[PDB]
Design a protein around this ligand. Sequence first.
Ligand SMILES: [Mg+2]
Ligand SMILES: [Zn+2]
Ligand SMILES: [Zn+2]
Lengths: 43, 357, 80, 48, 302, 242, 224
Amino acid sequence: PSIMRRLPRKEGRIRKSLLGSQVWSISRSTICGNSDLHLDEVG
Amino acid sequence: KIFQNVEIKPFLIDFSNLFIKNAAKKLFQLEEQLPLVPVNVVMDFKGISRAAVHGLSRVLQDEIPNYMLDIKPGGYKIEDSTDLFMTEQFIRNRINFIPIYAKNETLVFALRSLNNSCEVKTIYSRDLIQVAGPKLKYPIFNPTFEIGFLQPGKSLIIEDIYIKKGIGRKHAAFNLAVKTHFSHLDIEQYPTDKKEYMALSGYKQSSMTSDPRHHRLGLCFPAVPLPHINQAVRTYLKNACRIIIGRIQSIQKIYENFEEPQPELVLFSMDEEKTKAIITIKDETHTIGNLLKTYIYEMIPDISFVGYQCVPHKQEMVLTIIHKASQEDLITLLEKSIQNIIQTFQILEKNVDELIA
Amino acid sequence: MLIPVVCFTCGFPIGTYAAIFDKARTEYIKTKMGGTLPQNIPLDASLQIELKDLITALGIPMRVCCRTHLITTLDYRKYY
Amino acid sequence: YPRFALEAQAYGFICNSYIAGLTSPEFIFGEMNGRFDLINKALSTSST
Amino acid sequence: GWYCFSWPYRVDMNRFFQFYNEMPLVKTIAHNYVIPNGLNTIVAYMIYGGYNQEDSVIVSQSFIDRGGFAGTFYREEKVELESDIESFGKPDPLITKNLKPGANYEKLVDGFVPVGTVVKKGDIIIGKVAKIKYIDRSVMYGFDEPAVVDAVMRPHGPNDEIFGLMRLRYERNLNIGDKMSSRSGNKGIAALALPTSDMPFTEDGLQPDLIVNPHSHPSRMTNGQMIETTVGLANALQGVVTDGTAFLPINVQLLSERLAQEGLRFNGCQKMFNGQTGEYFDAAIFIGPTYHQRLQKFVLDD
Amino acid sequence: LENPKISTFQMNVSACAWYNADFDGDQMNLWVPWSVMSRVEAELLCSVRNWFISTKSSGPVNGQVQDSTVGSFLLTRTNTPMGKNVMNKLHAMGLFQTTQTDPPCFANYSPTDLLDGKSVVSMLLRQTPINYQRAPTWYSEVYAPYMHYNKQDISTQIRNGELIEGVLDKKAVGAGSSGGIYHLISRRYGPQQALKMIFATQQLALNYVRNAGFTVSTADMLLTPEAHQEVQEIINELLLES
Amino acid sequence: TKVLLTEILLDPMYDYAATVARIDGSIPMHKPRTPKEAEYEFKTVIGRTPAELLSQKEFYDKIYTSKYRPDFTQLTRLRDEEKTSTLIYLRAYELFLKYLQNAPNFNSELAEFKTYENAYGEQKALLAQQGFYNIFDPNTGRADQRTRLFEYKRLPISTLYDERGLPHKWTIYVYKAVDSSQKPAEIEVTRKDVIKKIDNHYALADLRCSVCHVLQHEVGQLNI
Ligand SMILES: [Mg+2]
Ligand SMILES: [Zn+2]
Ligand SMILES: [Zn+2]
């Protein structure tokens, strides 16, 4: 374990914590077809 | 006579086949027909719209109240059911779909299967013992259903198997009739064997233009007692009619209160002396919507618009009627159409009584 | 794990004839099997085992779905 | 196929349609072509 | 499918036991060595309202209620102790510390929830307190869908120390968002479920279990799925099961003439009616038994 | 969606072009803005009407896909195996009962009057009158020698919202079609109005196939015995030249 | 006592012996509900009291032994099939117990019963057959071999070149009128002109070469 190994890679500090972010108030699910919804609507 | 020329025939076991005869004799000691048989009914309707006949078919399929066998919570005795493969979900799914011809909602059954042998033992529906209700003078289901099987030294105890009532569109175990035939007898047909016609339906008129009014509808009922077939089928038919009438009558209760602000009906006064009416009935299907649209359209040939969209994810029927009359005239025509529907199905019920003797 | 009580597609009561259709079917196969080990029946390349008339003798209609689910359903008792 | 075969079939010419079915050598040559579609799809994510 | 023949004796994690399996009407030599996994669903290749576009499918709700692709899904809860510090038992609010807020400790019996009870989110399934007066090292059921406790046991580990093993079961029907596939690799997501009176039906009463878009074929060229439906259509009526192994000699022209010998049409298409309106289509529809399989991608888990 | 049994994110198939998505097992994220500032910004900037026109290619992103492309062709087709492609008043009214627009007026029509697909389409495109004249995807010089094209189907012409002639297919109504019906509606009435017309025309196309029917079978892929002999005569000439 | 009970209740041997004890009624068909029932079931199955089990050093010597001792010498192939299944089950349990106890002369008996159970499994495999069908060629009497596969054939060289040696270019479409009264009888057009000169009153008869001006169907009249 070192201080400067926290930085470099995709799982590092810069790319995982600063350039991206874990967030609250978000949802995920499989998407599905529905022909009764308008193009600007989501079920 | 809208409904004439019914024909009824049961589905029976052919005991002239040696394999079937030997298997039936060795398994259940079965020598004659089972107490409950499937019954095919073919009906001819004349001078009636496709909407009414198809609504009757749909109601007889999965919109008529019907009975099944279910397990009350706690009925599956975990302490006593030692079998590892006969789970509650599996056995409950099996039992729910046994077709019954029940007389009352008070009968309660039980299943107490013990396997004291070194071979797997099959649990049949003849092992369903009645434990509550008046003693049955005739079985309500066949005894030849494979409910399950127990490994050697295992048990299956299920109590409180009761009769549950519902409609098939909620759970398929309440479905009643299976479709076996539907045709229009007043539309000519092609010979579809020929390779020049095999990609077409067969009717010589397009569905976008044709208006058939003479139909043949054939439905099969899964479990009807042998000595009372005519009594059962007739009942079913009449029941369906009443069901439809009831639902239509509910909408008759809406139009009668159009002066009072009511959520199921919205009236608008548009331009060019045109009145718009929107009827939103929750938990209604294409049966009543199609009936309403067809009969309003027949009552008002020169209507500006009528539609009945039923969206699956909204779970309601929305009927839109745009007509160049005032609100009062529109409501009057609406009750006239509803009365025509009621009269049609009352005539259907009378013909059902007149045909099946 | 068994032949379903009703047809999965239309709901015709297939199950009430399932057990019988089991036993009879085996007997029928015993007539047509012929000098071939049982586990090699699906490999014989000379067999003509048709159950159409056997199912018809049970009263089951000529529906594609019902006969499909009756003929093709696996039995857990026969593999365990 | 033999060594220095001159026929067109030996080098990936599939004479059959899908509705008629491919033979074993035709299916192998078709699997060679179809494997690239899977490889290039997996590469089109990382390379892009 | 039947993922294991000894499933009741196992406490496995994320395992699914599908109840009903069928041999394909058009089987192969691979089915002499492994159990088939799937059902011979009746499939209509048609446009029905636009709900099966872009690789979606329309499923019969009745087919779902009857047990089609239904099964039981299993999860595991293995909890370990610290030797002579931790123990299994129901905590008490007036002694123990940092209990989880909004947790239901009332379902525990001697530290374990009894077998046969329904556990929902926030229920404590295994009680565990460490002696400092006490700190609550409990396990809370953090899943949206409720489960049922299927088996509870206290086996002995490699160090001869007690750990708690719990098996939780889920009654998994087919539901919207679950993935199905044919043996030709044409997968799909269940998009709409219709009642038995809304599905299309043929003149002879046949109705589909799945409705798949015809637009999934032309760009993918999964012709073995269409030939299987053509062959299996005559197999059902003839009461037979045939072999459709790859590289066996076939003639689609003769397989189509086999349909006309059984009273059907050459193309296997039939006159169908719209179940919602009762109106016939101005086109015969290709409908027949196609073997479909349920892929173990559950929307309830994703 | 009030049904408790539904766990999926449902969207219109014509909205899949924004996300390069389909329904073979894709999963998508969804977060709802709660703060006022982010909830204002979602409406005014990030609404999907702001990307009907591609920033990458400067063309429309959305259109008909796979059921309303062939459904529009079948609806606007001049002739049918049953004769002329017409429908009575009741079935013409039924095409508009799902479009969720204001229904047109059918009062000047007897129950036995027949309306064709071009009249029904015109009743919808009158609200956003555009001008369009291109040859459809249906016409190809590749098929012309071996097919009898109808002279009323190979020239799509719309003036002021009235479909004078021709069929509607991928060229006019397809997704990503530059200069198409929805690209022209967006340039004249806005990308939000174009999205309404993609939905409204998709309901007309799907409601036509609701009793026209569309299927694919195995016999659709089968050459006749005489034609199979002609294909392997062609292949034998290739192997002869080889 | 508790650790011994927990160790043994999770032993598959214990559940197998308990099943054999239930089959002949030595123990109740349901699981124990009380400490007394559990102790009685343990005493019957294991053959020793849990407290007495520690006392000694044997474990397998007194495990249940089925009550009915059928004659397994009729397992020598010699209301029989259900009896055969019963004999298979009991013999399997008895040999399992023998293997646990390392009883002398076990391997030979094990192989013998393996042969017996292979025969029994063959019978069960017969029971587990759905059927099978082969589409026969009527001309033959066996599985159909007719196919629509491609079949190579060396065509005449005249199908590619004319009598002057130049290649064919099939680029003239020849249309004949379906109706006899229609005039002109034939129209020859190029691909770009078909939409301009041909209607449904004509049908495509044949192609034509643009070099030697021969019909495709009359290419065999060229001297090879
Ligand atoms: Mg995908
Ligand atoms: Zn069926
Ligand atoms: Zn030439």
